[PDB]
Amino acid sequence: SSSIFQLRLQEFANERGMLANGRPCEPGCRTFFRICLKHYQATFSEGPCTFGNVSTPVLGTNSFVIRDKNSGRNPLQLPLNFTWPGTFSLNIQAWHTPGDDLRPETSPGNSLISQIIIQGSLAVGKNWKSDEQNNTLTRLRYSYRVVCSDNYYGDSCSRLCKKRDDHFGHYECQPDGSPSCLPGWTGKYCDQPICLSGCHEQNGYCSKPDECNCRPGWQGPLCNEAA
């Protein structure tokens, strides 16, 4: 995967602890989430989660604030098998499980609480796009983004840069994925040594930075003196 869809769940409110069918959660709504990501579609929803899907363990009961956990993770991660199309559909479902929190999705007694559906445009970037969905029973607060995987760069995450300090290159990685040459090197892949200052362009050369070596028939510190 070259890019990742990241979704951060921030706040959920279900103050009366109700299910979608109108029955109250008993004793409380033990809430976990289901995420369905897919391509943009305006027509009534058809078919599977084409961009991927994921489920969470129970994060809270009834109303609760959801906090991040770098390592039940939040933000959630959906790694992508494709270059990011630029548009999407997102479906978030809130569920109640009467069973144990280990893979609540596999539990037989689950009942839906509520769900939302969004669609739109998103560019790859580190900025979080923030959204709220309020209805009379429940509220959901969240934010999302698409960022590159480690060592992928560019507006479509299509360019790979991995830092080198050996024979093939001496560089770091810029935000656009282009190599940033360490001091004394040049060229696209930073594999060209910058020869000593004033070393004759045609008659002198270097294999190491800050050096001047003479081609046949030349002499002096800068290799500019014929024979």
């Binding site: 070259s2 391509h39 943009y40 027509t43 058809e46 078919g47 084409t50 098998n81 494709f82 270059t83 199309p85 299509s158 360019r159 790979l160 840069c161 991995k162 080198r164 050996d166 024979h167 093939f168 290159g169 994925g177 892949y189």
Partner: protein, 115 residues
Amino acid sequence: DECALGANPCEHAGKCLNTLGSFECQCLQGYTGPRCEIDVNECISNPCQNDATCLDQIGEFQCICMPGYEGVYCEINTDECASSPCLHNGRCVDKINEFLCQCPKGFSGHLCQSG
């Protein structure tokens, strides 16, 4: 020769081959650029028709069809009347991801099969 000097210069498991006095990469399918660092965009040729969406994938493209379309390029309108669904000699009309049965007088229902 030159590939021996250092860690493989070809990204994405590419194949280094020495050439005289320098070198080149033989990239796995779907990758381009001198050192295989660029993911080829297979969707550049815009193969997908009928408002379909082209997914650029590694070494291949996939067209996601609007509902009711099929084929590699979403170039085929699926014939929903192929199985002859309509009963009591109703008329099947092939629509977009749908089929409408027009019943003769006195018949009703989706497949026109009632009193």
